[PDB]
Amino acid sequence: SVAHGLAWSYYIGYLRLILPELQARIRTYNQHYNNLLRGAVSQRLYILLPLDCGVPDNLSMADPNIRFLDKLPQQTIDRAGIKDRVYSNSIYELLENGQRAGTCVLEYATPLQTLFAMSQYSQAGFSREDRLEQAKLFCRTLEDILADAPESQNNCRLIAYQEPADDSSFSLSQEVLRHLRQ
Amino acid sequence: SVAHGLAWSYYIGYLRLILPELQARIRTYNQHYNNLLRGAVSQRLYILLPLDCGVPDNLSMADPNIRFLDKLPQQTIDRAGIKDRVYSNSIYELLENGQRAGTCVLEYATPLQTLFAMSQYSQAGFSREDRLEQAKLFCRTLEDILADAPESQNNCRLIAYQEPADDSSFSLSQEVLRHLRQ
Ligand SMILES: Cc1ccc2c(=O)c3cccc(CC(=O)O)c3oc2c1C
Ligand SMILES: Cc1ccc2c(=O)c3cccc(CC(=O)O)c3oc2c1C
Structure with a gap:
């Protein structure tokens, strides 16, 4: 798969x-x-999992209740296959009613970018329907892996969503916040 | 798949x-x-593809005839879902007759590490036999992509290999050199 x-x-x-x-x-x-x-x-890494596999260039620009604050201190790698990569993570401010309301480390799951790319290249032989199925399956599989991984206990949270075509203008911030508030 | x-x-x-x-x-x-x-x-990226999916943390050690020379200057990233990552690439010298006979940018394909891990974790439901067939399928699929990709013409080389049953006398150095001199 x-x-x-x-x-x-x-x-x-x-x-x-x-x-x-x-x-x-x-x-x-x-x-x-x-x-x-x-x-x-907050203490966890919040991972965004849009089922439509839509990943913005800018997380901040996309939502008005999500505002980029700052970066975490950099990290350096010396596990196998990676030496001297430098990583950073970004902290976001969440507003509710022009207020408050949260500060968290937040990012899109990169493989959704790949799922999207595949759906748009004829070479992938990958339909948009295939993409949706795999996106759900990706989320379930990852949930399972993380549940059992020594590395991943209490320091990571998966935020899976679909923005409904019907009616509403969905709030990414309400979604993140609901997860956040615990 | x-x-x-x-x-x-x-x-x-x-x-x-x-x-x-x-x-x-x-x-x-x-x-x-x-x-x-x-x-x-040399001006291409030489990507090592061990089909047995064995990837050392230290390449230079895997072959004494392959030594780390230097690092390319760091590259910083703008692209989405990754801001301000820093990548580096390593330069290696290859030897024939104990003397330098080539210099190239050389690295192991990271996804083989993943394939190796999947073979080692029960949860992945992934056998060793599975792993080899998927590794060959990985090499084939990657070739097809790079064959017609705009980003990747004349700047990349895939070196896929198996170390034989008869001998560990197999030399990566010569394999790389072989590709290198053309
Ligand atoms: C820009 C981009 C796009 C897709 C992936 C990815 O699918 C992917 C899948 C597994 C592991 C990585 C490495 C990472 O996320 O640092 C991945 O990185 C990606 C990156 C950096
Ligand atoms: C250490 C390690 C292990 C496996 C992958 C990987 O499978 C993988 C698959 C697709 C894309 C990436 C990102 C990259 O290789 O820069 C990947 O990175 C990995 C890295 C960095």
Whole structure:
């Protein structure tokens, strides 16, 4: 399955690298800033899983209640196959009623970009329907992997959603917040 | 298929982001004052593809006739879902008769690590036999993509190999050199 490999490669090639040091980098960030006397970031890495596989260039631009705040301190890698890559994660501000309301490390799952690309290239032989099925399957497979992984306990949260074509103008921020509030 | 998703993901998530500025970076390295006239590096990316999916943390060690020379200058990333990542690529010298006989940018394909891991975790439901067939399928799929991809013409080389049953006398060095001298 396309989704199966993606769920595994996302875990092996990213999450494992990132997760172990994440709580620490966040502790660093909360104590070391100011900037600023007003904080403060949640402990998990919130992963966005749009089922439509729509990933924006800019997460901030896309939503008006999600505003880029800052970056976490950088991380360096020396697990196998990666040496001297430099990584960063981004912190976002969430507003509710022009207020408050959350500060968290937030990012789109990169393999959705791949699922989208595949759907648009004739060479992939991958239909838009295939994409939706694999996107759901990707989410389920990843949930399962993470549930059992030593690296991934209490420091990661999956936010899966579809924005309904029918009626409503969906709130990404309400979605993130609902997950956030625990 | 697992391979299909891995190959497409490797193209979308690494190659088409790294290849466009590769030749520019190589020449810049080739130009540099410090870079003694000895050893003009070749202009393509040499991607190692062990079919047994064995990937060492240290390539230079796998073959004594293959030694790490230097690092290319770092590349910073703009692209979406990745802001401010920093990539680096490594330069290696190859030897014939104990003396340098080639210089090239050389690395193992990361998704083979994932295929190896999947074979090692019960949850992946992935056998060793599965792994080999998926590794061959990965190489084939990647070839087809790069065969007609705009990002990837004349700047990339795939070296796929199996180390024989009769001997470990198999030399990667010669395999790489073989491709290297043409
Ligand atoms: C831009 C981009 C697009 C897709 C992937 C990806 O599918 C993918 C799948 C598994 C692991 C990685 C590596 C990572 O997310 O750092 C991946 O990275 C991607 C990147 C960086
Ligand atoms: C350490 C490691 C292991 C596996 C992958 C991977 O499967 C994988 C698959 C597709 C894309 C990427 C990203 C990349 O290789 O830069 C991938 O990165 C991985 C990395 C960095």
